[PDB]
Structure formats: C-alpha cells, structure tokens
C-alpha cells in the first residue's frame, strides 16, 4: 500500500539544532514534491516547506525563512529537516503531507505527527493525590501535578469503569510544569465498592503509579 | 502572497438544518479550492476539490460553489456526527495556504449546573503547596462565572479554570476551577468559598466550607 | 508491459464470510482496474470498474480497494452463485492485461468413497487392446491415490485419471482411472487389482478381478 | 439488440493459414476499437490484438508479433484476422471483444467463441463399448472435439457423470460416462447410450445388458 | 465575484449622444477587455465594439466603422460609449459582455440590458 | 466573416434525432461556441472549443466538427429544450454571431 512514518521529535533547549526525518514505504519518489505541515497546540494549521523530487524547487514559509533547511537523500525515499536557532514559540506537532490530482481523482496522504517542544526544564515524574468525596450522587477525583512533558494517560479500574468519567485538558503553570485532574461521578450509596484505583501512565519516563481513594 | 479568510468564527445549529460557510480571498486564484475537515485528535480528511466536485465515499448532502474571489460551502440536514473544524485551501503553485478554521456545534435546551467543592488533603499539605478545587457539571451554554472568596475577601489573579469538550450523548459541558496558595495562607484563614453564577439559575449559588472539619 | 499478480489460486469459505482476493501490479497505473467473473465455461461477466463501483444488476458484493499498486476484492458472505473464477484487468492505454485467476470451493465435511471395477468387454478384446477402469465415487476432498496390480505387480506410466467438477448438490468429487494394455499381455495374466487410499478410509481398500470368471 | 458472430475456425494441419471473421450486428462501427482475446483449454485468458475504428492503432501481444495481422474492410462492419505458420500451443477458443466506458455506465460485449484445434491428423468417427454390471459407457478413438453423449434421449438425466475428455499420446481422444442405477431395476424399459459427433454425421445408439 | 450592471439611457429624439456606462460591481478590470452587444426586436444578437484595458485594439463593427467613440476611464472602473448622428434603425436592447477562457473552464458573466428608442 | 445556418425550422415530436449545421466562411481553427437563448431571458453558453461540454449541463447535447464544417446534435427534443441557437467564433479580438434557428411547433 502506502503509509508514511516520521521520527526525530521530542524536547530541546532554547536555541540548539534538531533533525527530523520522514520516510515512506509503498511508492517510488520520482513524481512530485513533499510538504511539511505543523499544527500549534490549540490553533489552526500552518505550512512550512516543500521539496520537489530531485530537489530543485525549494520554497519555505514567511516566518520560518533563514533558520531551517530541508533536503532529500538521493539513495532512498527519505526527506530530512534540520532546525537551528529554535525559539520558545516553535512548539507544535509536525506532519508529512503529499497530494496530487489526476484525471481519475485526488490522491492525498498524511503522516502521523511527532511532538516537538522547546523549554528549559528536565524530565520529572507525576505526583498523584486523591480527592475525598465525603444526599444525591457523589463525585471523586484524582489529581496529577508536576509532570513534564506531555502526554499522560489516566484510566480507572484498569479501564473497567468507563462510565461517568471526565478528563479535563492539561494546563501549563507559570513555573513550567503541567497539572490536571480527572473526575468520576458515583452513585449515592455505593458504600464498600469493589475497588477504585488511579491508573496513570507516563511514556517519556516509566512511572506507572496506582493509588486508591477512600472517604 | 495570498491571504485567505473565513467569515463566521463559530456556528450553532439544531439537527436537520442548513448551514453555510464562506471563504474570501485576495488576488485571483481561478477555480482552485479544496475544503478539509478535522475531527479532534486525528488527521484531516479531504471533502471537496475544484470548488464544485466531490470525492468518492462522501455523502451527497455537502455542496460548494463560487468562482474567482468568493467561495462557499453549504450543508443541509446536519446529522450529529459531522461536528468538526473546516479549513479552506488553495493550490495554484508550489505551495499551499490554509484558512483560520470554523467550528460547528449543536444547540439544545438550557441546563442547570451542579456544583461540588473539595477541601485540600494532608499529603499535599505536607509538601508545602495547597490547592482548592471546585467543579461545575452539566450546564449549557458555555458562558459561566465562578468567583473565589477567602474569609469573606475577594481574590483575583491566582485561579485557573478549564473546560472540557462538548459530549456526544447529553451535549453538556463541565468546568473545573483551581486555586493555588502556600500553606501559611491556608492556616492563616478559616473560611473558603467559591460562588457560581449563570444564565440558567435564578440566583447565584454559594458554596463554602470551614478549615478543620 | 505491466505485469500483474494475484492472490493464491484456490480458496474455501464453507458458506463463511470475509473472503478477500488481492491483486498486485507494477509501475504506476493510477486507478484503472476491473474485476471479471467466469463460470466454468460460458463467457466473462463484468462486476466492478474503477476499483470501486458496483455494476447495474450485480448483487451486493462489497469491494473497497486502494490506488497505486494494491487492490482487493471482498465477498461479504457466500451463497451458492459464487463458485467460479475471478480475473483482474487493467485499462490504461490501447490494450489490456489479464491476471491469472482464482477459484472458490465449498466445504461440508469428510466423506468415504465407493470403489468399483469393470472388466474389459469382449468386443474391445477383439479390437486388440484391453482397458480396465477403477471408479471412485462420492469422496471428499480431491486428493486420492490408486495403484494397479497385475498378478501382484505394481505398474506405472500406463494409467490415467479424470476428475469432474465439484457437484452443486452434495459437493463431492468423482474419479475415474483407466489402465490400457495389449491383448497378448492381457492373456498372460489372470489376477488384476485396483487399490485405493484416502484419508476417509481407515485402511486401504483393494478390488480384484481374475480372468475367465 | 446487440450481438456478435464469428466464422471460420476448425481444424488445420500445422503450418498453412486461416482467416477469422467477426461480424457485429446491432450498431455501427464509428468510435473506438475491437479486440481479439483467446483462451487455451483449461487455462487463463490472454490478449492478442486490437484495432481502432478508422485505420490506425494496431498493437499486438508479445508472442504473436511478426506473425498474424488484422484488417477492417470498408463499407460493411467486418473485422478480419489472418493467421499463418500456426504451430502447436496455438489451439484455443477465440472471442471478439468490444468495450468502452461512457455516460451512465460501461458497455462491454463478447462473442460466441470459435474453436481452433491444430493437429496432424484427420477426421474420424468414435467407437462405442459398454461396461458389464451403476452401468457405464465408453467412447474411444474419435476426432475432433466435441461429442455429446446422453441416455434415453434425455428421459433419464439424473445421477449422470461424464468425465472430461483425455488426450491420448497417440493423437486421438476418448472418454466415458456412468449413470447410477437402482438396486433391482430389472426389466428396464430401454437404455440408449446416444452419441452425437458434429464434424462427422455418425449418430450411433447402443444397448447394455448384464 | 463579478456582477456587471448597465445604467444610463432613456427616451431620445433623432440626434443626441446619451451616455452609456458599465461600471462593474466586483473584482477589477486589469485583465483582458470588455465588449458591447445589442439586440433589436425581431432579430438576433449582433456585434458592437470591443475595448481592452488602457489604449488597445478598439476594432468596431461592420455597420458603424470609424464613427463611434468609446473610451475607458483610469480608476473607478467603467467603460464609456458615445455615438453621434443617430439614425432611426437604432432602437434595441443593449448588454455588457466580458468573456475569457482559462485552464479550468469558461467565464461568461452576462450583463443586463437597457432599452434605447429613437 | 459571414456564417449561415440551414435548418431555419424544426419539425420533430417528443423524442427524436435532430441536427443543426453551422457552415463557416473560411478555414478557422477549433474556435467555436454555441449559445442558446430562451424567450425573454439572456443567452447561455453551451459548448466551447467545438467539442467540450462545460459544467452543469445535461449530457443530451453533443457538438462536433472542425476545419470549416461544424454541427450540433441532440438525442431528443423535450418540451423544456425548445429555444433559439446561435453560433459564435472567439478567435482574435472581436466576436461575430450568426443567424437564428427557431425550433418550430406543429
């Protein structure tokens, strides 16, 4: 078939280099160009750079010109991207895009996206605290705090309980660390219930921590 | 360079209605346009190309028209599974250009929010930072106000609020308000409260508690 | 000059579902493909063109395929009007290029054969050449082995076998084995035997013929 | 309606030449082209040649170039095809193909099919033999295909098995048929192994008795 | 968007030079040109005149060679037409036309007509 | 450039093959367009380049021809599709229309 894969993302301190790489599998790269598209954490899409096959026509964006470079390795179907002098504003998700039209219809293909972030902070494990629930249905919650970088995954009862659950989007504190809470509504008189557990999972640092909440 | 704009920033309609979104450009781009669509937490999908045509597999309730410097997209009979963000696009050279993004949501009757408040726990008190949280559930529409009182004194500039996405079952929101402080401020005072006001309720609702119980 | 390859040449479903056939090409053929279907022998019949488009009058045969070089055809449950042979086809210029072909069978259960033997006819003896037939009837599946003994002596290279097409009522195959020889050698031997082996039978079964009786 | 017919074909001594003619009744040959597609006995399909409507776009297959040719007579809508220097493995069944995609949907039309068998032999009638007591019928030493064999002129056409013909190394064909029979169907009305050969009128009927 | 609107005209007596205007309501007029076309009752359409942007070919029709006067106007997009020595067989309905073909298809944008009677 | 159209009248029932001829003056290239006008309205383009069909049109029309001879053909008539038809040439800077072909009734 055809499916693209890109890699090289992660974290970097403010103003050094970084290299991405997007490669494909299923076709031979000798027809048209390839584009890089970045999406901000909560804004709309934006376009960065395009490279033609056997790279001759090279075009960049307006706010990225000068400090970026893009090239093609003339052995395999792999395209590179070399970034220098990063600023605190370039923190996003980078895709890999390829489309073209023919008398039979459109052809469009997207990558998957690797998160890229810039800051001045190390890697830390999340801290987990309960919320005591203590007339009508009650609610109980689990609070994670000081984890970096995103994302973290939370689930109750190892996924057994998936009804009446909410996980608010993460927010950024002033010091540079993330925090969020997750809440569950519970019947009025579920006293002595089987088990309530906070299953948390952090990918950058393996710190799988399970906690319990009691009244 | 070419800049593209979308007129309506956000939409709101009931089921089985008609909605239109208009894309305006500068300069001249002929009949070259394409409309995308992105559901949350995924990659976009192509819907309409050449400003009039349609790709295979797309339901026939979508339409689009326009020429030269004014384009539009029309949706009739809005089913509740097409809530997403839509982007323009133009492909007239070795380079693309996107729009700003129009969001589509659903309307229904008003709702009465439910309010809870959680006192701080001992483990976080040991560390040296105390957080007070109160939670709002099942209210509509989005606009709501929550205020923080400590010992009958108003606070500002040290609280943050977060809202979730609209649910696909009951179409209601949820809000969490968090207030951070150091311990000394916590044992200095005794009374805490967060007050909530909304369109739905007749009078503002007060929730409060006292330290030590 | 666009070589094509297909999925394995045989398949079975047992009135099942989710039967897929895969067609792979070379170079770039864009999206121009057609799928045919030939019942044992009448003429080909067209089913799908442009790699996803149901013809007018064909029953529901869901078939979603990609582009570039990969195509698939699905069956979605199999009635009894789907025993046949399926061919790929390309059309990108003046000319065509067909595929190899894939069959479909039907499985019910294991069965036991019935073995019979026929002595040569006297008129055929007068003709100067004698022929003896071992007939195996109503066995499944196709694989089987027969051996000819002439006075307890094995023979090879002077026998042939024929098998029909899978019946549409009880879904079993039939086999005929013919052994030919000269009259003079026939008169020099008296005992003849056809011995068969199959997975259904626990032990090999031998049927014998002796001249003059 | 729309239909196609092919003429010619049959049996030819290896070498020599033939001429196959395709006639299309139901429309007018004014746009696009027509193709020739052949099928070997018990194998897959393969493409042979194409012709455009007016005078051009003549393309052949890989192992058919040099030999063969195609032509279209004016006025009447005829398609001729001349073959020569036919060796073995060119004996097959030929069709006439018309196809184009337009408007509401596709338009494809196929022909009846013409049989061509190359052999260094001559026509010959079959020889029939019975089998002693189901009951069996054997036909041998006939040429060329096909032969139609049945029982009781179709009155008894249940439980009948007719195995595909087998090519003997000598150069002549043979086959057999068998019909399941009840346990004690003694004193049956009639059992006629009717056989029919098209190239040579040799209608023979036989009887079987224990 | 382009929506040509035609204005200016009315009842006239033999001999006058009433003005005709074709101010556009969208886009601009820096591309190609613009034509005029009339239709008298009981007859088909006929050619009148063509003007490109700025000084360019001003080729006239067959009945009115070298007698009419048509001009553009720098900025405030409009085309101005002036005729003199009116005859009697010049009562018709006048349109405004702009046509040009592109690699995506045609563009017609047929204007609206007004009546002129001697 | 003087052009002409022969069939100034039409006589066919609901559903019939009709032909229209658009003889030209000299050897122009494939630069020709067909316009259709219904009473009390404004003309509308039908086919350009003497072969194309243009978007948002029924497929029942078909034009052909080249060199100096050009034609038009409709599979049927339909009461909706009775109007007048004009020929245009769009080479060079100036245009030139032709004569009308009224689809007569009874």
């Amino acid at each position: 078939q055809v499916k693209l894969v890109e890699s090289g993302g992660g974290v970097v301190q403010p103003g050094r280099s970084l290299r991405l790489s997007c490669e494909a599998s299923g076709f031979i790269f000798s027809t048209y160009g390839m584009h890089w598209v970045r999406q901000a954490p909560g804004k709309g899409l934006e376009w960065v750079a395009v490279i033609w096959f056997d790279g001759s026509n090279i075009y960049y964006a307006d706010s990225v010109k000068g400090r970026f470079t893009i090239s093609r390795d003339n052995s395999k179907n792999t395209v590179f991207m070399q970034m220098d002098s990063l600023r605190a504003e370039d923190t996003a998700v980078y895709y890999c895009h390829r489309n073209f039209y023919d008398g039979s219809g459109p052809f469009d293909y997207w990558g998957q996206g690797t998160l890229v972030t810039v800051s001045s902070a190390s890697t830390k494990g999340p801290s987990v605290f309960p919320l005591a629930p203590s007339g009508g249905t009650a609610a109980l919650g689990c609070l994670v705090k000081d984890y970096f970088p995103e994302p973290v995954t939370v689930s109750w009862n190892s996924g057994a309980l998936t009804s009446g659950v909410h996980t608010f989007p993460a927010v950024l504190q002033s010091s540079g660390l993330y925090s969020l809470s997750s809440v569950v509504t519970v019947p009025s008189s579920s006293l002595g219930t089987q088990t309530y557990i906070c299953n948390v999972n952090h990918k950058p640092s393996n710190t799988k921590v399970d906690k319990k909440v009691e009244p | 360079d070419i800049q593209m704009t979308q007129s309506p920033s956000t939409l709101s309609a009931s089921v089985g209605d008609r909605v239109t979104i208009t894309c305006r450009a500068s300069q001249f781009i002929s009949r070259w346009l394409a409309w995308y669509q992105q559901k949350p937490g995924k990659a976009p999908k192509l819907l309409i190309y050449k400003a009039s045509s349609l790709e295979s597999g797309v339901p026939s309730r979508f339409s689009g028209s326009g020429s030269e410097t004014h384009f539009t997209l029309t949706i009739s009979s809005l089913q509740p599974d097409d809530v997403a963000t839509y982007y323009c696009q133009e492909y007239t050279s070795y380079g693309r250009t996107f729009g700003q993004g129009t969001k589509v949501e659903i309307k229904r009757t008003v709702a009465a929010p439910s309010v809870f408040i959680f006192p701080p726990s001992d483990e976080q008190l040991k560390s040296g930072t105390a957080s007070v949280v109160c939670l709002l559930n099942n209210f509509y529409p989005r606009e709501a106000k929550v205020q923080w009182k400590v010992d009958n004194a108003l606070q500002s500039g040290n609280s943050q609020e977060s809202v979730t996405e609209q649910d696909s079952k009951d179409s209601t929101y949820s809000l969490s308000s968090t207030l951070t402080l150091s311990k000394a401020d916590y044992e200095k005072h005794k009374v805490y409260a967060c007050e909530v006001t909304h369109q739905g309720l007749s009078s503002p609702v007060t929730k409060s508690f006292n330290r030590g119980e | 000059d666009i070589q094509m390859t297909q999925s394995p040449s045989t398949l079975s479903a047992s009135v099942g579902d989710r039967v897929t056939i895969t067609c792979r090409a070379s170079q770039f053929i864009s999206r121009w493909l057609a799928w045919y279907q030939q019942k044992p022998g009448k003429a080909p019949k067209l089913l799908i063109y442009k790699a996803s488009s149901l013809e007018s009058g064909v029953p529901s045969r869901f078939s979603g395929s990609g582009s570039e070089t990969h195509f698939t055809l699905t069956i979605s449950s199999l009635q009894p009007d789907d025993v046949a042979t399926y061919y790929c086809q390309e059309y990108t210029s003046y000319g065509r290029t067909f595929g190899q072909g894939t069959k479909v069978e039907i499985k019910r259960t294991v069965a036991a054969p019935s073995v019979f033997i026929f002595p040569p006819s006297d008129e055929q003896l007068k003709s100067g050449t004698a022929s003896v037939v071992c007939l195996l009837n109503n066995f499944y599946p196709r694989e089987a082995k027969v051996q000819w003994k002439v006075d307890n002596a094995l023979q090879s290279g002077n026998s042939q076998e024929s098998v029909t097409e899978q019946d549409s009522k009880d879904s079993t195959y039939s086999l005929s084995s013919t052994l030919t020889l000269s009259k003079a050698d026939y008169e020099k031997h008296k005992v003849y035997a056809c011995e068969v082996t199959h997975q259904g039978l626990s032990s090999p079964v031998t049927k014998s013929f002796n001249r003059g009786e | 309606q729309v239909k196609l017919v092919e003429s010619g074909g049959g049996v030819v001594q290896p070498g020599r030449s033939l001429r196959l003619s395709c006639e299309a009744s139901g429309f007018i040959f004014s746009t696009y082209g027509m193709h020739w597609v052949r099928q070997a006995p018990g194998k897959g399909l393969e493409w042979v040649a194409v012709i455009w409507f007016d005078g051009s776009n003549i393309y052949y297959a890989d192992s058919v170039k040099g030999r063969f040719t195609i032509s279209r007579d004016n006025s009447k809508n005829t398609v001729f095809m001349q073959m020569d220097s036919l060796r073995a493995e060119d004996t097959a069944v030929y069709y006439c193909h018309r196809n184009f995609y337009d408007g509401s949907g596709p338009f494809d039309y196929w022909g009846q099919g013409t049989l061509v068998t190359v052999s260094s032999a001559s026509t010959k009638g079959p020889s029939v033999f019975p089998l002693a007591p189901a009951l069996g019928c054997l036909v041998k030493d006939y040429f060329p295909e096909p032969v139609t064999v049945s029982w009781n002129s179709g009155a008894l056409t249940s439980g009948v098995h007719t195995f595909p013909a087998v090519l003997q190394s000598s150069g002549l064909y043979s086959l057999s048929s068998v019909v399941t029979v009840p346990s004690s169907s003694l004193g049956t009305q009639t059992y006629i192994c009717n056989v029919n050969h098209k190239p040579s009128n040799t209608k023979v009927d036989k009887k079987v008795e224990p | 968007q382009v929506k040509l609107v035609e204005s200016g005209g009315g009842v006239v007596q033999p001999g006058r030079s009433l003005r005709l205007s074709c101010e556009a309501s969208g886009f601009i007029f820096s591309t190609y040109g613009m034509h005029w076309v009339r239709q008298a009752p009981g007859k088909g359409l006929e050619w009148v005149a063509v003007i490109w942007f700025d000084g360019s070919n001003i080729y006239y029709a067959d009945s009115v060679k070298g007698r009419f006067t048509i001009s553009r106007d720098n900025s405030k997009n409009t085309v101005f037409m002036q005729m003199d020595s009116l005859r009697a067989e010049d009562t018709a309905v006048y349109y405004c036309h702009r046509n040009f073909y592109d690699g995506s298809g045609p563009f017609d944008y047929w204007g609206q007509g007004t009546l002129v009677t001697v | 450039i003087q052009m002409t159209q022969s069939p100034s009248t039409l006589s066919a029932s609901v559903g019939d093959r009709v032909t229209i001829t658009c003889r030209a003056s000299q050897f122009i290239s494939r630069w020709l367009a067909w316009y259709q006008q219904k009473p009390g309205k404004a003309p509308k383009l039908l086919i350009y380049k003497a072969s194309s069909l243009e978007s948002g049109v029924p497929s029942r029309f078909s034009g052909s021809g080249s060199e100096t001879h050009f034609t038009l053909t409709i599979s049927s008539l339909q009461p909706d599709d009775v109007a007048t038809y004009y020929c245009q040439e769009y080479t060079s800077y100036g245009r030139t229309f032709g004569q009308g072909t009224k689809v007569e009734i009874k």
Partner: peptide, 27 residues
C-alpha cells in the same frame, strides 16, 4: 495556437492526459 482570450499556463499539481477508453466529459 495563440489567442488573446486563452491564458497560457499550467498547474504543476495536476497533469492533463485523458484515457483513450474514456471520454473526457466524465462527471
């Protein structure tokens, strides 16, 4: 093949080449 009405250009993202077995007026 030169008129002042037709715009001489091309779009690199689309290649025009009709398939002979198919008319170019397909929807």
């Amino acid at each position: 093949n030169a008129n002042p009405n037709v715009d001489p250009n091309a779009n690199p993202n689309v290649d025009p080449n009709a398939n002979p077995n198919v008319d170019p007026n397909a929807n």
